[PDB]
Design an enzyme around this catalytic site. Structure first.
Site, PDB file in Angstrom:
ATOM      1  CG  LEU A 275      60.286  -0.658   2.983  1.00 15.47           C
ATOM      2  CD1 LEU A 275      59.807   0.703   3.490  1.00 15.47           C
ATOM      3  CD2 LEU A 275      61.784  -0.765   3.089  1.00 15.47           C
ATOM      4  CB  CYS A 276      55.980  -2.215  -0.725  1.00 11.40           C
ATOM      5  SG  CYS A 276      54.816  -3.376   0.031  1.00 11.40           S
TER       6      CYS A 276
ATOM      7  CG  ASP B  72      40.660   5.560  -0.930  1.00 12.66           C
ATOM      8  OD1 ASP B  72      41.837   5.897  -0.673  1.00 12.66           O
ATOM      9  OD2 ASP B  72      40.007   6.057  -1.880  1.00 12.66           O
TER      10      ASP B  72
ATOM     11  CE  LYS C 119      48.774   5.355   9.552  1.00 14.83           C
ATOM     12  NZ  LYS C 119      47.524   4.703   9.080  1.00 14.83           N
TER      13      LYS C 119
ATOM     14  CB  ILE D  44      59.033   6.432   3.134  1.00 16.66           C
ATOM     15  CG1 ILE D  44      58.068   5.639   4.034  1.00 16.66           C
ATOM     16  CG2 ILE D  44      60.477   6.038   3.389  1.00 16.66           C
ATOM     17  CD1 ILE D  44      57.981   4.149   3.750  1.00 16.66           C
TER      18      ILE D  44
HETATM   19  C1  LIG Z   1      49.509   7.723  -0.917  1.00 15.45           C
HETATM   20  N1  LIG Z   1      50.433   6.521  -0.875  1.00 15.45           N
HETATM   21  C2  LIG Z   1      51.473   6.570   0.247  1.00 15.45           C
HETATM   22  C3  LIG Z   1      52.896   6.085  -0.201  1.00 15.45           C
HETATM   23  C4  LIG Z   1      53.913   6.015   0.972  1.00 15.45           C
HETATM   24  O1  LIG Z   1      53.271   6.464   2.168  1.00 15.45           O
HETATM   25  C5  LIG Z   1      51.974   5.923   2.513  1.00 15.45           C
HETATM   26  C6  LIG Z   1      51.264   6.876   3.480  1.00 15.45           C
HETATM   27  C7  LIG Z   1      50.944   5.720   1.383  1.00 15.45           C
HETATM   28  O2  LIG Z   1      50.879   4.272   0.963  1.00 15.45           O
HETATM   29  C8  LIG Z   1      49.554   3.643   1.220  1.00 15.45           C
HETATM   30  N2  LIG Z   1      52.173   4.592   3.081  1.00 15.45           N
HETATM   31  C9  LIG Z   1      51.374   4.053   4.002  1.00 15.45           C
HETATM   32  C10 LIG Z   1      50.196   4.586   4.613  1.00 15.45           C
HETATM   33  C11 LIG Z   1      49.439   3.899   5.569  1.00 15.45           C
HETATM   34  C12 LIG Z   1      49.862   2.640   5.924  1.00 15.45           C
HETATM   35  C13 LIG Z   1      51.034   2.102   5.315  1.00 15.45           C
HETATM   36  C14 LIG Z   1      51.801   2.789   4.354  1.00 15.45           C
HETATM   37  C15 LIG Z   1      52.950   2.532   3.609  1.00 15.45           C
HETATM   38  C16 LIG Z   1      53.817   1.435   3.525  1.00 15.45           C
HETATM   39  C17 LIG Z   1      54.873   1.502   2.666  1.00 15.45           C
HETATM   40  C18 LIG Z   1      55.116   2.640   1.863  1.00 15.45           C
HETATM   41  C19 LIG Z   1      56.063   3.027   0.919  1.00 15.45           C
HETATM   42  C20 LIG Z   1      55.719   4.326   0.503  1.00 15.45           C
HETATM   43  N3  LIG Z   1      54.610   4.706   1.141  1.00 15.45           N
HETATM   44  C21 LIG Z   1      54.238   3.731   1.949  1.00 15.45           C
HETATM   45  C22 LIG Z   1      53.138   3.702   2.809  1.00 15.45           C
HETATM   46  C23 LIG Z   1      56.482   5.159  -0.517  1.00 15.45           C
HETATM   47  C24 LIG Z   1      57.558   4.270  -1.214  1.00 15.45           C
HETATM   48  C25 LIG Z   1      58.270   3.348  -0.097  1.00 15.45           C
HETATM   49  C26 LIG Z   1      57.270   2.273   0.395  1.00 15.45           C
HETATM   50  C27 LIG Z   1      55.483   0.225   2.858  1.00 15.45           C
HETATM   51  O3  LIG Z   1      56.463  -0.125   2.216  1.00 15.45           O
HETATM   52  N4  LIG Z   1      54.820  -0.579   3.768  1.00 15.45           N
HETATM   53  C28 LIG Z   1      53.673   0.153   4.323  1.00 15.45           C
END
Ligand SMILES: CN[C@@H]1C[C@H]2O[C@@](C)([C@@H]1OC)n1c3ccccc3c3c4c(c5c6c(n2c5c31)CCCC6)C(=O)NC4
Length: 598
Positions: A428-429, A473, A381, A355
């Site tokens: 998970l968001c 950040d 992660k 994702i």
């Molecule tokens: C630049 N934004 C990214 C969007 C995407 O992937 C990232 C890398 C980043 O979110 C901080 N991401 C995480 C990075 C580091 C720790 C936790 C998360 C994370 C998380 C989620 C998430 C989601 C997305 N992303 C998520 C997350 C895209 C749409 C579905 C939900 C999530 O749902 N829980 C942790």
């Protein structure tokens, strides 16, 4: 067994703990150790570095000859006092003839050298140096250290303050100076003597540094009071250095008299004063002279230290590897570096579609079936170079911090899998990243919603303040949407995001809650601007330039002019005039209630 060696290669850590930890072998000689630490920093002038061991509560010093075997140097000294109170520090001892000049074309070495000399200056004579001199010196260390700041910065009350009261001028100046002058005037003195070094890059700073020291602190040699001769022992001060070789001077200052060059030195020998006392006996056979040059040093230690000096030099002047001191596989040398409930078995995770990307590891969707309890959607992660151990240790360091937080607008840690590859399991968001979320719904979200988000964010950032946690950040890229009426805060881990940064962050690499608030301001803007980036089509230098001149981000259409002024209160140059997080909370609270009733 291992070894800690303190050195003078930079790190964003505190200077007194710059070190390397080496897993040495049993026949490993001091050469090995030095070699592997300087190869590890891309040093071109290997032949100039030595190893100096000294007890903490003692001021004396022990130079460890290249050819000595570490474990039976431990053996020897660790039989006197515990390893806890011994300090192994890597130093430059053997200057080539053009040394400064030469180190220019060897960036690590110049830096190492500069630090090593700067350290001594502070420790040895800084207190009793001239007022103009101290001033001039201190400023160059500001100039060099804080590369990316523009010259006129120190003529700003807030900037100077950050140095006075957050950084500590003690990092640049002796306690003697700071004490003996009124602080408001001290502010002038600096701003002033800083003018002369306004436009000097890191390299020139270092040389101007040296240039100003040299006349008032010899670092270009070492001296020893000692006695010359084999029978009619006569008392002299020896100077040993690159542009003089071995020299006696006496006196007073006046001309130093030449004795030999290092390239003349056939062999070295030293021994304990076989005579009554305890003195060091040192013999040097020289070029064609049939009688050894005989030195008597106050102690056997000094004698040993002087032999190390002379050897080092010979071994340098000649392109030599073995020693010049006549004597009475496993040498492996690795470079290394220094608990949970919430464990999850990997077999209890169904790893869904990737994702989000990681500069360190990808993030994935997932099912988590916990034996007692129903399935659960989770984020995962992942780790790529997870086998390399400190990279692993730093990865799941992030999970450690997330353990601490429990608040409804911070992304909840669910567990970890502590075997390679390391996995961090979190909630998970479902509705994704905030920026995307906003652009898409640009025309279906009432204003009351947009500011609701900032409100929720602020409650989180308040909570984080309350635990002294700086985030570094804050941006809409690090926000995720877990439901229509609910957002959460993102990364918490370890190409700079210039456009969101507070000025003191771009200037002094400083990162406080108060730097956090600035970013949150920009974050708030982004929200109200339905997910557009601040400064589209402006390169970073014009941005720092505009920020510096007074330009701010404009009011987004539709922003209650109260809230917009709050944004600009967050954008106060002087970080201390910025709102607290507990305060932006309270305000947004009301600014929302008012918006709810329309
Ligand atoms: C630049 N934004 C990214 C969007 C995407 O992937 C990232 C890398 C980043 O979110 C901080 N991401 C995480 C990075 C580091 C720790 C936790 C998360 C994370 C998380 C989620 C998430 C989601 C997305 N992303 C998520 C997350 C895209 C749409 C579905 C939900 C999530 O749902 N829980 C942790």
């Amino acid at each position: 067994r291992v070894l800690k060696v303190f050195h003078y290669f930079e790190n964003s850590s505190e200077p007194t703990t710059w070190a390397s930890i080496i897993r040495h072998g049993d026949a490993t000689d001091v050469r090995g150790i030095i070699q592997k630490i300087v190869d590890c920093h891309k040093v071109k002038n290997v032949a100039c570095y030595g190893l100096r061991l000294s007890h903490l509560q003692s001021e004396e010093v022990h130079w460890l000859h290249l050819d000595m075997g570490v474990s039976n140097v431990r053996e020897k000294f660790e039989l006197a006092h515990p390893p806890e109170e011994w300090k192994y520090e890597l130093r430059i001892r053997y200057l080539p003839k053009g040394f400064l000049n030469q180190f220019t074309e060897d960036k690590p070495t110049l830096n190492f050298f500069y630090q090593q000399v700067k350290n001594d200056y502070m420790l040895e004579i800084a207190d009793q140096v001239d007022q103009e001199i101290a001033l001039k010196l201190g400023c160059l260390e500001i100039r060099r250290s804080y590369g990316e700041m523009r010259g006129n910065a120190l003529e700003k009350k807030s900037n100077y303050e950050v140095l006075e009261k957050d950084v500590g001028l003690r990092r640049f100046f002796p306690k003697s100076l700071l004490d003996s002058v009124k602080a408001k005037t001290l502010r002038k003195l600096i701003q002033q003597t800083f003018r002369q070094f306004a436009n000097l890059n890191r390299e020139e700073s270092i040389l101007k540094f040296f240039e100003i020291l040299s006349p008032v602190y010899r670092f270009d040699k070492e001296c020893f009071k000692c006695a010359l001769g084999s029978s009619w022992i006569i008392s002299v001060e020896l100077a040993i250095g690159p542009e003089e070789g071995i020299s006696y001077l006496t006196d007073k200052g006046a001309n130093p008299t030449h004795l030999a060059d290092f390239n003349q030195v056939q062999t070295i020998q030293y021994s304990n004063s076989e005579d009554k006392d305890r003195k060091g006996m040192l013999q040097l056979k020289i070029a064609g002279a049939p009688e050894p040059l005989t030195v008597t040093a106050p102690s056997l230690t000094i004698a040993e230290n002087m032999a190390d000096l002379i050897d080092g030099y010979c071994r340098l002047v000649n392109g030599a590897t073995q020693s010049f001191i006549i004597r009475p596989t496993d040498d492996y040398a690795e470079i290394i570096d220094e608990t949970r409930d919430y464990e999850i078995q990997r077999e209890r995770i169904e790893l869904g579609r990737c994702i989000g990307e990681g500069q360190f590891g990808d993030v994935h969707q997932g099912i988590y079936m916990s034996p007692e309890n129903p399935a659960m959607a989770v984020a995962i992660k992942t780790c790529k170079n997870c086998t390399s151990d400190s990279v692993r240790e730093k990865f799941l360091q992030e999970a450690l911090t997330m353990r601490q937080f429990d608040h409804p607008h911070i992304v909840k840690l669910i567990g970890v899998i502590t075997e390679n590859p390391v996995w961090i399991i979190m909630e998970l968001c479902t509705l994704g990243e905030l920026r995307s979320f906003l652009q898409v719904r640009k025309f279906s979200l009432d204003l009351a919603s947009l500011i609701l988000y900032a409100y929720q964010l602020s409650t989180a950032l308040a909570y984080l303040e309350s635990k002294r946690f700086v985030h570094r950040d804050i941006a809409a890229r690090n926000v995720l949407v877990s439901a229509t009426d609910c957002v959460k805060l993102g990364d918490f881990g370890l190409k700079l995001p210039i456009k969101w940064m507070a000025p003191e962050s771009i200037n002094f690499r400083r990162f406080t809650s108060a730097s956090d608030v600035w970013m949150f301001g920009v974050c708030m803007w982004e929200i109200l601007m339905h997910g557009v980036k601040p400064f589209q089509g402006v390169k970073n230098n014009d941005v720092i330039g505009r920020i510096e001149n007074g330009e701010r981000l404009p009011m987004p259409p539709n922003c209650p002019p109260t809230l917009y002024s709050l944004m600009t209160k967050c954008w106060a140059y002087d970080p201390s005039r910025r709102p607290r997080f507990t305060e932006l909370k309270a305000q947004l609270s009301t600014i929302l209630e008012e918006e709810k009733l329309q």
